[PDB]
Amino acid sequence: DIPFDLIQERTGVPSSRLKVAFARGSLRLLESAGMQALLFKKPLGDLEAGTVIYLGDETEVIRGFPKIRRTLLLSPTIQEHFRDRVAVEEKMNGYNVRIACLSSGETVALTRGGHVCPFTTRKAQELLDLSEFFREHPDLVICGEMIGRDNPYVSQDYPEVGPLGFRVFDLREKNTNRPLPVEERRALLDSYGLPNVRLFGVYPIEEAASEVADIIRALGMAGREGVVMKDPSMEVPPLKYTSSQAHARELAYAFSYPFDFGRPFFFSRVIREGFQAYELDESDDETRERARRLGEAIIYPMLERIKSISAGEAAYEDTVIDVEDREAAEEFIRHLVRLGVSATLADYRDGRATIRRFYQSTTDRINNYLKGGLY
Amino acid sequence: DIPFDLIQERTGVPSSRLKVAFARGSLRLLESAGMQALLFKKPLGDLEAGTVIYLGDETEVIRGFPKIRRTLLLSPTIQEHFRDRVAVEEKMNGYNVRIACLSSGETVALTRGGHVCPFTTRKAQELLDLSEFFREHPDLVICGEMIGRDNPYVSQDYPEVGPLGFRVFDLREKNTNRPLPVEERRALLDSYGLPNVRLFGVYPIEEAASEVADIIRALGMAGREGVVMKDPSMEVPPLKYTSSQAHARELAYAFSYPFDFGRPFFFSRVIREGFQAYELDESDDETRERARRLGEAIIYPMLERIKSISAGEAAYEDTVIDVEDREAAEEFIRHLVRLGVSATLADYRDGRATIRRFYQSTTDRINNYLKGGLY
Numbered sequence: 119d120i121p122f123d124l125i126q127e128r129t130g131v132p133s134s135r136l137k138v139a140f141a142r143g144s145l146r147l148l149e150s151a152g153m154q155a156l157l158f159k160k161p162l163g164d165l166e167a168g169t170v171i172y173l174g175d176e177t178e179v180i181r182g183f184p185k186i187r188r189t190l191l192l193s194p195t196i197q198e199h200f201r202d203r204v205a206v207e208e209k210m211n212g213y214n215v216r217i218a219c220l221s222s223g224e225t226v227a228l229t230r231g232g233h234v235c236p237f238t239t240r241k242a243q244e245l246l247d248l249s250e251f252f253r254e255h256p257d258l259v260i261c262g263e264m265i266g267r268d269n270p271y272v273s274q275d276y277p278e279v280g281p282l283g284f285r286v287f288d289l290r291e292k293n294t295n296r297p298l299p300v301e302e303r304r305a306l307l308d309s310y311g312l313p314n315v316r317l318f319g320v321y322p323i324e325e326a327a328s329e330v331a332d333i334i335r336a337l338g339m340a341g342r343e344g345v346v347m348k349d350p351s352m353e354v355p356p357l358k359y360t361s362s363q364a365h366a367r368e369l370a371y372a373f374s375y376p377f378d379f380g381r382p383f384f385f386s387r388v389i390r391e392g393f394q395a396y397e398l399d400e401s402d403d404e405t406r407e408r409a410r411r412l413g414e415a416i417i418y419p420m421l422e423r424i425k426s427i428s429a430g431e432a433a434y435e436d437t438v439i440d441v442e443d444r445e446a447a448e449e450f451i452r453h454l455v456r457l458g459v460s461a462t463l464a465d466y467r468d469g470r471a472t473i474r475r476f477y478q479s480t481t482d483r484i485n486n487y488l489k490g491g492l493y
Numbered sequence: 494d495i496p497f498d499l500i501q502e503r504t505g506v507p508s509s510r511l512k513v514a515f516a517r518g519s520l521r522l523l524e525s526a527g528m529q530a531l532l533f534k535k536p537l538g539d540l541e542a543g544t545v546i547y548l549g550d551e552t553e554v555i556r557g558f559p560k561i562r563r564t565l566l567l568s569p570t571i572q573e574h575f576r577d578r579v580a581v582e583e584k585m586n587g588y589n590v591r592i593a594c595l596s597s598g599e600t601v602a603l604t605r606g607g608h609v610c611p612f613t614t615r616k617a618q619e620l621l622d623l624s625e626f627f628r629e630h631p632d633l634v635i636c637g638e639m640i641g642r643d644n645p646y647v648s649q650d651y652p653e654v655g656p657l658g659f660r661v662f663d664l665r666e667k668n669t670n671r672p673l674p675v676e677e678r679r680a681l682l683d684s685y686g687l688p689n690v691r692l693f694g695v696y697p698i699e700e701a702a703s704e705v706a707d708i709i710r711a712l713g714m715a716g717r718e719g720v721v722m723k724d725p726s727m728e729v730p731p732l733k734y735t736s737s738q739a740h741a742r743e744l745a746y747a748f749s750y751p752f753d754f755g756r757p758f759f760f761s762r763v764i765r766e767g768f769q770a771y772e773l774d775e776s777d778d779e780t781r782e783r784a785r786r787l788g789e790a791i792i793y794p795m796l797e798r799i800k801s802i803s804a805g806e807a808a809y810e811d812t813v814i815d816v817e818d819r820e821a822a823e824e825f826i827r828h829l830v831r832l833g834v835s836a837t838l839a840d841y842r843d844g845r846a847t848i849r850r851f852y853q854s855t856t857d858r859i860n861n862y863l864k865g866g867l868y
């Protein structure tokens with residue numbers, strides 16, 4: 119049975135609360151070299167969502183990666199939130215991964231919710247040389263973004279990393295979740311040959327907003343996602359800020375499968391565009407480009423989707439990935455399915471699996487309308 | 494004390510459900526003017542929202558005006574829904590009004606929620622010659638749209654009525670809400686000199702969709718809202734279908750006050766544009782213009798509004814109405830306030846009242862962000 123009291127001492131969450139939690143968002147699972155793990159789907163006390171506790175020779179709390187706050191404006195918000203200096207890292211468009219070495223010496227890659235992903239743990243070890251780092255720092259958790267075209271979760275091609283890559287943006291302690299300061303983190307990771315996310319600079323607080331404005335303009339025309347701004351000593355939480363092109367990219371994806379996104383969502387992205395227009399557009403022409411960009415990002419993917427379904431095609435997206443074998447592919451599919459993803463293996467050859475994700479809500483509703491169903 | 498058994502008799506809603514709704518709402522008021530009356534805020538069995546029961550010498554149920562289903566497509570939806578023929582009336586963009594002569598001999602104009610609007614009651618009597626009609630038809634309710642640029646509730650310029658006018662789109666029986674057949678209704682109104690909404694035609698179903706498609710193209714290029722489609726004998730309920738220019742107008746208004754509407758207002762309207770692009774756009778030039786209209790309708794009001802609040806202005810909306818005197822104006826404000834509207838008389842000159850609506854939600858949230866508050 120579950121050692122609630124032990125968990126209570128390691129988490130600061132009273133055993134009573136943890137039994138309340140078990141009614142719903144606290145799940146026991148068998149995970150890693152035959153070990154028993156408690157996964158927190160919801161925050162609870164200081165424990166972030168996706169926190170996972172491994173019940174090994176010793177008990178290890180792999181804390182959830184904390185939510186990062188968003189700002190819609192650079193000024194006065196940056197000066198209002200930070201103090202003295204701001205570190206500005208690239209926000210990579212991928213999926214969040216925590217890599218930890220457990221007490222058993224087994225290495226684990228956790229998705230945001232706390233599940234071990236068979237695809238990700240394998241690509242982590244294939245792509246990263248982790249052995250020396252974990253021998254010297256076993257109680258540090260490597261927090262990074264898994265990115266690439268051949269990414270089964272969020273596919274964006276970052277040609278300077280290859281078809282699939284990884285970039286580290288945090289080192290956090292087991293149990294406490296305490297982050298290393300920015301510059302020390304980057305240097306440490308360098309000395310062990312691990313890859314850091316791009317850092318644009320560390321700027322004096324009075325110059326930071328205008329520096330980010332330039333950076334964002336640059337990222338925008340390259341189609342990169344945006345920026346994460348950080349207190350160099352991590353005593354003040356980070357802020358994220360994204361580019362107009364990132365918003366159009368998300369909105370176009372969303373209006374390609376309009377009924378699979380929990381309605382807004384949508385309003386959230388458009389509001390970003392309003393405040394950004396207010397702050398960053400330096401001519402009417404620029405605002406009219408922004409308008410056009412937004413209109414087409416919404417209309418055309420929708421139009422094509424409806425056209426496509428009209429012609430008999432179900433809504434789906436394919437991603438081709440590396441797998442160990444067809445069995446590994448299938449195991450990954452099961453993992454996606456239990457996450458609530460409608461997925462199947464659509465093709466397989468060698469170690470290349472075509473993962474097909476279905477968007478049935480969009481297929482159903484657009485079909486029903488096409489057949490005379492009423493709004 | 495409320496005669497629930499009598500209301501059950503006259504509405505078919507069980508006593509129990511009435512008492513329970515009264516325990517929430519379902520609300521009790523005095524109107525016209527030593528009459529006690531019952532206002533149904535929500536639907537309840539066959540009774541529509543905005544139903545009002547007048548407890549006078551006769552017990553009269555002024556039924557709420559029914560919701561009208563919307564369609565996103567002309568084909569095959571019209572012929573899946575209707576039977577044999579389709580009457581196609583212009584959809585007017587104003588506000589919905591029910592005019593009834595009560596058993597007491599008093600004439601009353603109800604807005605959609607069931608409230609007597611003192612402004613509207615006076616304007617209807619000035620605009621319309623009702624007395625011969627109601628003397629011969631005391632139990633018919635006149636259902637229409639009050640339209641025009643100088644509107645107290647929703648303003649759009651309709652040249653054919655001047656600053657403000659009225660168009661009848663339904664005659665419905667007290668108590669039963671039974672509507673007269675379309676063509677009979679139209680002739681009846683003509684013979685008493687009452688003004689009908691435009692009726693473009695009555696078409697066989699096989700031709701109805703391409704006919705509407707042309708009407709809509711005409712209404713769009715003319716800035717009109719759209720169309721309400723109807724079974725001539727009203728055996729099947731009506732469908733409403735709106736133009737692209739209507740959607741732009743709606744979105745532009747909404748995004749002038751983004752945090753007071755929705756979140757959609759946005760998703761609902763945008764989706765209309767997708768299907769309409771698919772069915773009606775003849776060329777990619779048309780879809781391109783559609784996307785431009787959409788994006789501008791979104792970005793520009795939002796930008797203008799952020800600018801305006803950034804410069805110290807609160808978010809508000811002014812409309813000018815022709816009133817009898819300052820007293821009439823001041824009466825209309827009191828009415829708005831007791832419905833929970835944040836309104837004031839911003840100005841009065843020579844029979845013209847400037848009615849100012851405040852939107853604190855938009856003001857406060859845009860202000861929060863502007864002062865460096867976090868999303």
Ligand SMILES: [Mg+2]
Nearest residue numbers: 210211212213
């Ligand atoms: Mg992301």
Ligand SMILES: [Mg+2]
Nearest residue numbers: 585586587588
């Ligand atoms: Mg309307």
